[PDB]
């Protein structure tokens, strides 16, 4: 009942990203394969969206293009370590209804103090590498 795909996105020179609270770093579009008609992007708020989330990095999956009115999808995000291995993930508890231009994600994906702590190895060589797995419900 689902078609599963994944995507990685490396944000080089992460410490040079000057985005403040409410601002966004956006990935290029991606899809499940060359024949896929859907287009998706990731959007990261490195200092959250508002005062109550400013201590988190927020991460969203955005449906950029789809042929019909809606797409239902489950999704999971993780950060890759220096070996390109998944660390902790955060995964949606169900499929969510996307329409063109709609996002779903986690406002509190990771605490900034955890992300920035050298002990955790999440910014190797000043790169933030995000990994997204999506399970698209087939219509």
């Amino acid at each position: 009942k689902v078609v599963k795909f994944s995507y990685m996105w490396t944000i080089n020179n992460f410490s040079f990203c000057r985005e403040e609270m409410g601002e966004v770093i956006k990935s290029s579009t991606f899809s499940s394969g060359a024949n896929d008609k859907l287009k998706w992007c990731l959007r990261v708020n490195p200092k959250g969206l508002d005062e109550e989330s400013k201590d988190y990095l927020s991460l969203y999956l955005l449906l950029v293009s789809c042929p019909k009115s809606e797409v239902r999808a489950k999704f999971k995000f993780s950060i890759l370590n220096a070996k390109g291995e998944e660390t902790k993930a955060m995964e949606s508890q169900r499929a969510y209804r996307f329409v063109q231009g709609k996002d779903w994600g986690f406002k509190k994906f990771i605490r900034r103090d955890f992300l920035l702590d050298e002990a955790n190895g999440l910014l190797p060589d000043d790169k933030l590498t995000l990994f997204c797995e999506v399970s698209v419900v087939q219509d």
Binding site: L49, A89, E91, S92, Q93, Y96, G105, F106, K107
Partner: peptide
């Protein structure tokens, strides 16, 4: 790895 299963939110 560990996966924390959570409700999603939207910015709209």
């Amino acid at each position: 790895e560990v996966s924390i299963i959570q409700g999603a939110d939207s910015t709209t």
